[PDB]
Every structure is written in structure tokens, then in C-alpha cells.
Symmetry: D2
Subunit: 116 residues, 4 copies
């Protein structure tokens, strides 16, 4: 599992469950192509987006649909989404965890990159 996303809700102090996440990879013509997507589980984690074979070097965009998450809880949040854009695998295969922490008017995101 080379790419994992984990989402937390800073208001409720809980995993952010059933959050939609879309991954795109920049194509040869500089447009975004759809790469993978999923929803976070009961633990706020999304595993199984991709495989070592499919996750080649490239520029990736992870879009987390924070607006639908807050709306489903009855809050009108500020942001439409949280987008995280980065180059992956440039020096060889790594494992990436993209974590995000959500509040209605703020978010933070952190990447944890490791070598398994």
C-alpha cells in the first residue's frame, strides 16, 4: 500500500468517516488524469487506492471532499475541498501517508513518507 490517506475531524475529535478522496496524476499533456478514488473508513483511513505497479513517478493531486463531509454534518464550511499536490517516487518507490485535519474554516495536511 504505497499511498494512504487519513482524515480527522478537529471539532468532534474523531476520525472523519465516509469522506470522498479523489487522486489524479498529471499526464503528458499537463492535464490531470483520474488515478484512483475511495472513501474513508470508520477509522478515517483510506487504504487500497493503488498498487506498487500502478503508482509510478509523477505529480499527483489528492483532493479531499471536505465540503460534502461538513454539509452532511449540517455545517456550511469555508473550503470547497482540501487539495494536496506533490511529486511522488522521484528517487524510487516510497510509502506516502497524506493526513488531513479538518475544521469548518481551517485544515491542515501533512505528508509522512517512509521506506518499506
Amino acid at each position: 500500500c504505497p499511498l494512504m490517506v487519513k482524515v480527522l475531524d478537529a471539532v468532534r475529535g474523531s476520525p472523519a468517516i465516509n469522506v470522498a478522496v479523489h487522486v489524479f496524476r498529471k499526464a503528458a499533456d499537463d492535464t490531470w488524469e483520474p488515478f484512483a478514488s475511495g472513501k474513508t473508513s470508520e477509522s478515517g483511513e483510506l487504504h487500497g487506492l493503488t498498487t506498487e505497479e500502478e503508482f509510478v513517478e509523477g505529480i499527483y493531486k489528492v483532493e479531499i471532499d471536505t465540503k460534502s463531509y461538513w454539509k452532511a454534518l449540517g455545517i456550511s464550511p469555508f473550503h470547497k475541498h482540501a487539495e494536496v499536490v506533490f511529486t511522488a517516487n522521484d528517487s524510487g518507490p516510497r510509502r506516502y501517508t497524506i493526513a488531513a485535519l479538518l475544521s469548518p474554516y481551517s485544515y491542515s495536511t501533512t505528508a509522512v513518507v517512509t521506506n518499506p
Copy 2:
């Protein structure tokens, strides 16, 4: 004035100076129309992006060129940029400040929405 951006550097404990910021407004076609841009000052602030006349309700993207900022410091960054996408307005007068706190592998952004 109606829209301000402030950027801080969590590594050095300083304002993030000379950071390029670009602002886009979403067109009916869903393309992103460039709208305003500048570089943060010595105080990490960028004022005078737009005017009350020009800053109408709509969906806006603020792109902060974090990768170039960390490269100017010799510090290796993860993200290509930090992008903040939101909906502006309605009721009553509003000023928007988009604040961002930068680290090489993490950033947070928060919207402070006030009225004079």
C-alpha cells in the same frame, strides 16, 4: 482590502517573505480565470490583491507557491504549492483573510472572515 493573505514559516518562526500568491475566480465553464497576484511583504502579508468592486460573490482559488519559497531557503519541500479554494459571500460586509502556516511536509490554512 476585501481579500488579504498572510503566510508564516513554522521552521524559522518568521513571516514567509517573497512568497508568490496567485488568485483565480471560477468561470461558468469551470475553468479557473486568473484574477490577482502578488508577493508577500516583509510582514508575510499581501494586501491590495483586489477591490470591493471587483471581489464579487463566486468561487475563488488562492495558490501559494510554497515549493519556490522552500527552495529559496535550501530546505527540501513536499508540496508543489498550497491551494485554498472557497466560496465568497453573502450577507453584510465581509473581509477575508487567508492565513497559511508552512512547514516543508505540512501546511495549514485558515480563513478569518470579519466585518468592519
Copy 3:
């Protein structure tokens, strides 16, 4: 002046107004001596805690009463307070701003250290 505090509310996207802040300096005995305090303004800022004469090198604690702030809003908080402990100085003139971003189950703080 040499020491300022700014507090933002990540739930409402506003300055955190009427937040009690207390500042302590560590004594040689390692007890915490109260030193300064106030409440944040409408802009979420607290200025005039101390003076250049009084703010000598040492170890300081800034305690932000987050629990009372969230209770005044009807929102259930996790933390009793947010406490920020640091060492002040040396070389050249310095101003310290302690910034805090609050959510009910999360907070961040950052120090912005500058000189006029």
C-alpha cells in the same frame, strides 16, 4: 509590544475574542511566577502584556484559556487550556508574537520572532 498574542477560531473563521491569556516567568526555584495577563480584543489580539524593560531573557509560559472560550460558545472542548512554554532571547532586538489556532479537539501554536 515585545510580546503579543493572537488567537483565531478555526470553527467560526473569526478572531477568538475575549480569550483570557496569562503569562508566567520561571523562577530559579522552577516555580511559575505570574507576570502578565489580559483578554484578547475584537481582533483576537492581546497587546500591552509587558514592556521591553520587563521582558528579560528567561523561560516563559503563556496559558490560553481555551476551555472557557469554547464553553461561552456552547461547543464541547477537549483541552483544559493551551499552554505555550519557550525561552526568550538573545542576539539583537526581537519581538515575539505567539499565534494560536483553536478547534475544540485540536490547537496549533506558532511563534513569529521578528525585529524592528
Copy 4:
């Protein structure tokens, strides 16, 4: 495992390994008593601090020794520590994860509280 701590390094994009964590519980006389301690593992996690039996209702303080972590990496950080203070188990036993994200001049902490 009712109390877990997880620490990340925002500069390196890695778990923060071998970070010392001290837990105290407020005693009947309002002083802090030492409750438990440990160091984070190679994955930035500290498990096995306490047990369901020992972790009773009370006010707890989790002190993360961030200054020794940055110093061991050759950085002089701003904060002496990150302290997280909270009431636990007030409505019955919960599982608490205290996460912290570290930079030299900034940190954030988030609590994730769940019901297993």
C-alpha cells in the same frame, strides 16, 4: 490501550522517533503526580502507557519533550515542550489518541477519542 500518543515531524515528513513523553494525573491536592512515561517507537507511536484499570477519571497532562527531539537533530527550537491537558473518562472509559505535529517554531496537537 486507552491512551496512545503519536508524534510526527513536519520538517522531515517522518514519524518523530524516540521522543520522550511524560504523563501526569492531577492529585487530590491539585498537584501533578507522575502517571506514566515512554518514548515513541520507529513509527512515532507510544503504546502501552497505561491500562484500563489504571486510567481512571481525572485531569491528565501529557508532556512531549519536543526540545530534546529537535536538539538531537541539531536545531534549537522555540518551545521547551508541548503539553496537552484534558479531563479523561468523565462519561465512562474512552480510548484517547493524542497526536502531535512538530516543527521547530510551531506545533499542533489533536485528540481523537473513540469507543472501543
